[PDB]
Design a protein around this nucleic acid. Structure first.
Length: 525
RNA sequence: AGAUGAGACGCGUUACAGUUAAGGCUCUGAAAAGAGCCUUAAUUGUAAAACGCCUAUACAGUGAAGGGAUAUACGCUUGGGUUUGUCCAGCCUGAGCCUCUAUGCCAGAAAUGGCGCCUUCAUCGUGGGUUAGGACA
DNA sequence: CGTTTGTACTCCAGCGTCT
DNA sequence: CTGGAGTACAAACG
């Protein structure tokens, strides 16, 4: 009777297979699932916000340019230049201008100031009030509509859509007063909490009946405070927690960033259990728990498989009855770095703030005088190795403090970057870490066995360096993270870094050390 | 005790062009030094920030009329684009519908009204959606 | 003897406030 | 962070 145990946890997960008829342990290990982080969806959303904001800005500039060319203010006129230069800084409008407003922000102005400047610029440009109000509407116009009321939806519950806490507050406060020792005052406290004209009499209850502080905190939270978040209300479990009618509805995939680690568990399950073992019962309810149950009954080839509810994690897995994951080379990941690099005359350069460079990077700056002032300022202050300069250290200023804030910028040269990583998209130049997708081994003439890199097809028309390939017969092609053997060696090796002579790793028994062997001497396992 | 999602505000980066300041080099002058080129920094303007894939039976603007909780959609059901070697998440969207979910701003105590918004028509144009994230090959 | 690949070493990567 | 860059150093085949 083979039993599979899942010790699912947050950072680590134990896996074990035990035969319960003899207490014989046949398989056990522990692992992590989390990649680098699955919170790079936050950086994806930040880039999505930057991209959509830039698209909206380009869209509005296009529309306002079209309208002003329709009126007659061509790009030669000073009126067009004045209003069109103002359109790049609209100013915020969520906060209405009236000491507090001046101490709030020091840049971006405000929408009313900007549109007052538009009124001034167009009354200097002989415009009518119709044209001025149309330009005012173009500045105030929304292009991508603000739809953020019910976007994500906690859904209908067979156990464990749903409405906001904003709209069903009466049910929550009733759930608070459900466990009170007084009956006739329940509806009175209901009328007291929900009415803002009856706010004062609620505080009498906490001294009259000596309730717990948690109860008082909950009542004050319901008192027009906890307005955010969705409750669990649906057609079922409106007010109760009855566990009847199991498996009434299907299960959907609404739990983002948890699928990643659940299928990371199921990857080693599929790779190490199903080809070799047959399990009669699996033991590990939450949405992820239900999803994981459905995925094991999908993968095991049995829709009715019984699934029921740091070496100590592996021990707990054995009682219930190494290996890290990481990736950035997939098709879903970033082609190239976010901040573009200057690539002139074969020299790779980037501006940086003076306040960012630290003591370990003394002599990378191009300009000599500011380099010297940087190192004397390093010895002037306590800013030793690894510390970036502060604004208080910027109070002893560098040359020509900026108009907007007390910093200064210098060019610098970037190491760890070569001509093979350069791609140019439009006018920009970025570096990439996905530029190799495979190693093509060629043999030609008398048997000259040599290898080339397969450049990435998505970027192949954008590389600055032409892709070197002479003619030959392609006999072999490797990819990243493959199993590979070495000519003249008995062990099995795995590729960590590829290109020319790929960097290969021991599949077992390594201690962090690496070794390189050319792809000519290489063959898969 | 966190989840992912919508929309902006800005700072940073890159390209091209302009102005100013400092330094170096070169030509010339009788000389003071005049001029030209380069470098670095400040500042100003414009443009780019996935590659791509799909869409013109689409998208967008203007004008008129009607509707607007009895209704619409950020909702439900079922399809489509992103989509690929295969399946998805997220976002956008076609048709029908209101079981679940949500419904903005101004005024009027309030009933309610006016804006935003949706639909139809006319006219004008080329624009629009999604792409830095996963999993199995 | 004169090249030619394999090894250590150092370094590289967008960031704030709001509703 | 992972996938890779340049750079100084070394031992081996042609």
């Amino acid at each position: 009777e083979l039993v599979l145990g899942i010790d699912y946890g947050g950072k680590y997960t134990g896996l074990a297979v035990v035969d319960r008829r003899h207490n014989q342990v046949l398989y056990a290990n522990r692992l992590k699932m989390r990649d680098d982080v699955a919170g790079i969806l936050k950086d994806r959303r930040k880039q999505r916000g930057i991209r959509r904001t830039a698209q909206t800005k380009k869209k509005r500039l296009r529309e306002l340019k079209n309208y002003l060319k329709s009126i007659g203010y061509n790009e030669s006129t000073a009126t067009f230049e004045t209003v069109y230069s103002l359109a790049h800084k609209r100013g915020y409008d969520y906060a209405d201008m009236p000491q507090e407003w001046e101490e709030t922000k020091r840049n971006s102005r405000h929408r009313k100031e900007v549109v007052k400047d538009v009124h001034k610029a167009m009354i200097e440009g002989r415009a009518t009030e119709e044209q001025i109000k149309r330009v005012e509407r173009i500045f105030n116009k929304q292009y991508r509509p603000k739809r953020f009321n019910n976007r994500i939806l906690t859904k209908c519950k067979v156990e464990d859509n749903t409405p906001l806490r904003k709209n069903v507050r009466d049910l929550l406060i009733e759930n608070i007063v459900r466990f009170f020792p007084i009956e006739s005052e329940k509806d009175n406290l209901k009328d007291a909490v929900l009415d803002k004209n009856r706010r004062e009499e609620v505080k009498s209850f906490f001294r009259k009946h000596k309730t717990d502080e948690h109860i008082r905190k909950q009542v004050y939270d319901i008192a027009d405070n906890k307005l955010s978040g969705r409750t669990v209300f649906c057609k079922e479990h409106i007010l109760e927690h009855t566990e009847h009618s199991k498996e009434e509805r299907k299960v959907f995939r609404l739990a983002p960033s948890l699928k990643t680690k659940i299928e990371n568990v199921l990857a080693v399950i599929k790779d190490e259990i199903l080809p070799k073992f047959t399990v009669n019962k699996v033991v590990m309810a939450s949405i992820g728990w239900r999803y994981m149950r459905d995925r094991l009954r999908e993968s095991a080839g049995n829709k009715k498989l019984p699934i029921e509810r740091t070496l100590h994690h592996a021990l707990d897995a054995v009682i219930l009855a190494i290996e890290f994951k990481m990736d950035k080379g997939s098709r879903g990941s970033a082609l190239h770095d976010r901040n573009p690099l200057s690539y002139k005359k074969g020299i790779i350069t980037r501006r940086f703030m003076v306040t960012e460079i630290e003591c370990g990077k003394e002599d990378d700056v191009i300009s000599e005088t500011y380099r010297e002032k940087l190192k004397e300022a390093f010895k002037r202050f306590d800013t030793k190795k690894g510390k970036c300069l502060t604004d208080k250290e910027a109070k002893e200023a560098g040359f020509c403090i900026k108009k907007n804030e007390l910093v200064m910028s210098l060019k610098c040269s970037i190491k760890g970057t070569g001509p093979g990583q350069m791609i140019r998209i439009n006018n920009n130049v970025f570096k990439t870490n996905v530029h190799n997708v495979g190693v093509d081994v060629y043999l030609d003439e008398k048997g000259k066995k040599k290898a080339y890199e397969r450049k990435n097809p998505r970027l192949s028309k954008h590389f600055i360096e032409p892709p070197p390939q002479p003619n030959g017969r392609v006999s072999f092609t490797l990819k990243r993270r493959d199993m590979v053997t070495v000519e003249g060696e008995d062990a099995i090796y795995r590729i960590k870094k590829l290109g020319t002579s790929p960097t290969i790793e021991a599949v077992v028994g390594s201690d962090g050390k690496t070794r390189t062997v050319s792809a000519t001497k290489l063959t898969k396992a």
